[PDB]
Here is the input.
Amino acid sequence: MLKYKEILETIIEILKKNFTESIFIDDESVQGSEGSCFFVSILSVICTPVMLNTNNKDIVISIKYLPKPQSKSIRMYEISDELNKLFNRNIKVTDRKLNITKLEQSIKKEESIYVLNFTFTLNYLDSVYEEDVVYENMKEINLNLGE
Amino acid sequence: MLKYKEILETIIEILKKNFTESIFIDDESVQGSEGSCFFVSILSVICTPVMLNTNNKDIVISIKYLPKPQSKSIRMYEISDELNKLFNRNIKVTDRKLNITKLEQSIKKEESIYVLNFTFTLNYLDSVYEEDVVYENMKEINLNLGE
Amino acid sequence: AIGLPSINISFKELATTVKERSARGIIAMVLKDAKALGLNEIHEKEDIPVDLSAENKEYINLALMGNVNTPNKLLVYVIEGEADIQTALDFLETKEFNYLCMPKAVEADKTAIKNWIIKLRDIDKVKVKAVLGKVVGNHEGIINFTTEDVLVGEKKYSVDEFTSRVAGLIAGTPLSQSVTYTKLSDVVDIPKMTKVDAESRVNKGELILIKEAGAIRIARGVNSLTELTAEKGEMFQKIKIVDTLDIIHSDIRKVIIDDYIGKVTNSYDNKCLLIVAIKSYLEELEKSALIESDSTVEIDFEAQKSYLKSKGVDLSYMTLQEIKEANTGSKVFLKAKIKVLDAMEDIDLSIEI
Amino acid sequence: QKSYLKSKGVDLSYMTLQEIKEANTGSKVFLKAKIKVLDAMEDIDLSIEI
Amino acid sequence: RKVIIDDYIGKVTNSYDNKCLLIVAIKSYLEELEKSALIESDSTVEIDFEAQKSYLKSKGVDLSYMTLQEIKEANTGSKVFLKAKIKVLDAMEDIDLSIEI
Amino acid sequence: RNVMSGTWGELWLDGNKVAEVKKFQAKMEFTKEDIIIAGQMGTDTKYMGYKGKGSITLYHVSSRMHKLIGEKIKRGSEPRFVAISKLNDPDSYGAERIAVKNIAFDDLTLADWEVGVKGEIEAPFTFTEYDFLDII
Amino acid sequence: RNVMSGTWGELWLDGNKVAEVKKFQAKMEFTKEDIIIAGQMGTDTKYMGYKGKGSITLYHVSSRMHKLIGEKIKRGSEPRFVAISKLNDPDSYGAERIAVKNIAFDDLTLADWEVGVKGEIEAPFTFTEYDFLDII
Amino acid sequence: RNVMSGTWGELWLDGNKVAEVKKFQAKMEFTKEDIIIAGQMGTDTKYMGYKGKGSITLYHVSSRMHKLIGEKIKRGSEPRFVAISKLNDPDSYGAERIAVKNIAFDDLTLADWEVGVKGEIEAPFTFTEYDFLDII
Amino acid sequence: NMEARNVMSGTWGELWLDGNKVAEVKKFQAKMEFTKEDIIIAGQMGTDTKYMGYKGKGSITLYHVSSRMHKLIGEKIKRGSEPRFVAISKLNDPDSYGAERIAVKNIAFDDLTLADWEVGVKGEIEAPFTFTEYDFLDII
Here is the structure.
């Protein structure tokens, strides 16, 4: 089908092109980094059967910005306004444009620092197609009359 | 009826065939394991009477992946996309195909690490059939006329 | 490709619009004499080869008249007087026929004829019938008849030569009705025999001739199948039912071999289409009131289960629907249950004053 | 249009059909038409049942 | 044959309307022949659907989507297929008469 | 044995498989007339006939419904269709097939859409007679 | 003593036990006519008769309802049925049985299904007379 | 392949693009008459015609609807309009266009507002005939 | 044999009056009433009838699109000369077996409506007529 790794790599590629700061996926990197760094991950996936063969899937994607010097809070709003432009309507992966139904962001206090959380939801229909087996030709077809 | 152990063993067998990493059920093993290991358990079971003899049962099954080296976060998404194929529509236990109504997964932060949680719901009707007792033949059947 | 422009007008007769499928009425008879060696099919009574002997001519005459209608087709094989038993049969195998009678009915021929009939009816799935005098084999294919010293036309006939007339009588009758309890006027006189003897013979042995009321008539004309099996049942003992079943089997074999072999791949959908075609054929048979209306055809669960067991699938537990749609492979197994209408033979009526 | 875009080095190994139909062709426009031409009757067949 | 060769060959296009006109002309000729008591007027002329289906399947197009009525109106190229049924009269030659006294 | 689920529903319309489908429904209403018999308080009823009704719901993947009837309706000729519905649940005991014949549609939806909502199309219909296949 | 629960409900239709059943209901409506008597403000009513109504709801395990009436309805002959309902709660004081007779069905549901929903079938009906057994 | 979303909806009214639009809807109801044929229990129907209905919903950015019909209606001359709706989803296979002709509006909303609520205007209409473009 | 679609619909009817097509037609009707006399025969209880003649009546209904009906007869009625007209009605339903076309000749109108209007009500005109002769064309 449409593997999640492809979507994740596409988002990482976009963020790598646009922003100079490093992008990490695992927690040890964001702890070890000496400067501000992005964090990208898939939050939740909900699959619902709507057809005999197709499924309705909703994907929520979370982007975080963690400023380590912590004196660069205005840069957070700058990055938010820059981010808002890239994800207007849809994103393109394996040439299948996925509608972005909603955009939500919030600034909350985590631990002793303030971080930016940016989320959006994708919606698309994906289906499984089972393998087709080749059958032999029929010969010597007999019937019995029990009654 | 349909024992839960059979369903659990079927799921463990599928995961053992597909993935090389070890699968554990108890907490001491996942704490003691030196590498990434799966965790499989039955989350909740809800029974509702819909007939004189049958019951409607909903089963929620949880699969967890805990990467201990913690530098293998991309392997988490790889395992998620691999898992998505095995549990498309239904699973087969004691030759009774059980419909899978919904698929839900999420990546959250637990303790100091990030883990993958994968859930799905099964729905089927199960019934109890009481024992039948053999009765004696009737003889010397008398009636009294009180009035 | 491109040719000269042309206009063509065609005139043809109206179509008969009858399928005709397998042949319904056709008789085969073998007799041993020196002349006219080989097959001599007889279209009608007027043309009889003169080289045949007088006794053979009388045998032809016995085989000629039918109970209700003249026989549709008569195939006669001429075998030499000393000629081997086997060769005639093997030659006839190539041709298709419905009924076989051997007027000599020598005790040597009965065993080979019975065995050959069984071999076709079981091994080769070819439905054929043979009528012989003193055969005891109670297979549904074998028809056995016994009546002593019958005198027809101020001359005495033996049982064996009269079996030819009996076979012609059976073959003449249409499928809709039965030969049971019918009057034949040619037989002027019969040996005397009581009703109790006739009942004792019919209940176990061959069909026999009896005299009652105005004329001498057949008595409960049925094939003798005294052994009973759960699959065959009692209905297989009656001659009309088994004849109708054999006609159905041969016709459906022709229909199957025409189109639904080797031409298309076998899938569950193809099996459903085949079942639909057979169902339509059975409905058409019902339209003429040969069988019952509500006959049903479905996949043979038992045969497919046995075949899958032979393949080592080990279906100790498996869903029924999955078995009915499993991967059979080269073969297709079907089972049909039908009901065959029988002519009225016994009537009960009660009146209150 | 697919051939022309291939000549331009777009490398549309994967690309949506609708996007190809509305892509930036440039100076040229490519069209295809399917029509059916009526032909005078030349051969006639007729069958009659008595 | 004479009428067809003289009039309808090479002079008009092959379309459903032209086929209908040719059918009407043939039917008119049959009606003309009827008054001579040679044949009966019940005769009908219509498009042979089987021949058209055979022609289309020989071409190889897929006729599943088109409606059954549409198949008759489908283009048939140069070929034209027609179907007719008639009944031919005869003079009385055998007479059976029975009277009841 | 389990109640057969509606997920495993397939529909063929005029010999063409309808891949996109959400609901199918066919129903039969009998027409009854009240009759009062002298001496009886109970009011018995007489069966006079029946009428067929049903509807189909499907996602708006393609303009399937237009091609069938849009051109013909304006011309004044009404087309009649045949539909087959097969419901085969692996858990259930068996599969049943219904042949609903002589179908006439009540309405045609040219276009319908709303911002943020996936297209959904439903079409009621009426039918006269039916044939039954593959009983359970 | 406790109110008898609806879980312990059993229904026999034409002598065959209906294993799959969700609800059963039988009811009796009286027909009353308003009569005004001179000198009285109160408006008294006269009893003129009754009509019987009810419905059954059951899961779509099998094509039970088709075999009963589907073939007969098209031919024009209406069948009449007899149903028995027994409600036996172990907590309650006793069990009661109702014999509802001369039942005629209002509709027949050939097929109905929706994605993700278990099949459910309901069928209204009307009846004329009843007999009562095993009073409480 | 995906179901076309309603977000990518564009509407042209009388050759002028309607930038502000929320919903569009066009529909066709057929008129059927019940006919009972002797000897048949089924009740077949005859097609007698059709009627067109639809509605538009848009935000109250400007007084667009007034300029079209407000002056003409009071004078007694009814104007007829032509509308085109195009639905082009990038995910979907293609785009379809509908030409709905001879449109007559049912009502005119001079003013409507409520405290704390953005202005929203909807207007039903009826149409006679249609033309179809860019099939899918 | 019988199918519901075959029943003809009145939407497809059309009318020509005096060789001109009348587009704003609502309904057309023509009928022939036979005149019969009761005759009693001696010895028979059943009363029999004798057919003696026929009389034709009909009517036309049409929307008040234009003042067509005035121009035909308004002045000639005052002058004392009564006009006569010929009407042709053709009913052609595509589902039906075929179209039928009946021509009605020697038409004389019963009345003329100068003006008939009411507020809030669309205009309509109805005119009954009597005819004498008719011919058949293209009947099924």
